[model samples]
Target: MTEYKLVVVGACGVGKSALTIQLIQNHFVDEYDPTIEDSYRKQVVIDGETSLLDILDTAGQEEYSAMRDQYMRTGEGFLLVFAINNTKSFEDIHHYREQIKRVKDSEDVPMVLVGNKSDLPSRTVDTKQAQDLARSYGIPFIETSAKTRQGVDDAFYTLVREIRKHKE
Candidate 1:
């Protein structure tokens, strides 16, 4: 079986940890304090191939910056998460994308622009803005809600597909 490493990153409080937990455990959580760093493994079938995913949920705080480069370098695919309800979170997507590109040393690195918190009605960021940003990067975009468990699977599955497609 092939193995892939995926990183979930965003600004603080954008639901990066919540998204990963929901995807692997199939459970929804209202609030998470903050992710220091966590790793998860799941065997998934992608494109008729069985692959193991090593998902790393990293902290969004500045302190995590020390080891962030190393973590970014290890990832084969990335989920660049941002919350639609928070403007700052949405803005931070650009920095995360730039970091991954620099660390991977490839402008076409596999990634997905994940706009989280879709269940909330108080969205500060619109879908079209996120789509335009993702388009400029030539990456897939998905809207997810950890609270309602919406689009969580699509976010990860699409990243897996992009990774495989990019690799080929």
Candidate 2:
């Protein structure tokens, strides 16, 4: 089985922890304390292949920024997540991407641009704009709602696929 080291990153209150818990625990956490760092391991089948996912849910607050470099170096793939209702969260995605690339010292690292919190009615980030940014970055963009479990699996599964392709 392949082992994937995946990292989730974004600005605070963008639902980073919510997304991770929803995926691993299969339920939405209505309230969460901000994470300093957390790790989870899951075994699953994706694309007919058994794989182990070692996911790191990192803190989005600026004070926790010191811990980023360590995980950034070890992660094999990344989910650059942002809340659709918050434009600043969307804007912060680039920094996470750039930091990951810089730490990995490669321009071609596997990553997915995630627009989270799609369950909310009010959206400040337009879909087309997110799509264009993903295009420019040469990565896949997905909108997910952890509360509804919509596109949550796809985001992680797609990241696994991206890693597989990158390995080839």
Instruction: Look at candidate 1 and tell me the lDDT of residue 32.
Output: 69
- Which tens-of-lDDT digit does each residue in 51-109 have in candidate 2? 99999998755753545688689899999999999999999988878888888889999
Whose lDDT is greatest here? 2
| lDDT (C-alpha, whole model) for all candidates | 0.88, 0.91
Off by over 4 Å in 1: 63-66
Pairs with backbone N, CA or C atoms under 3 Å apart (clashes), candidate 2 = none
Residue 75 error, candidate 2, Å: 0.2
lDDT of 1 by residue, 1-168 (tens): 989999998888888888999989989767666846789999988668888999999875575464778888989999999999888988888887888888878788899999999999887898999999999889999999998989998999899999889888
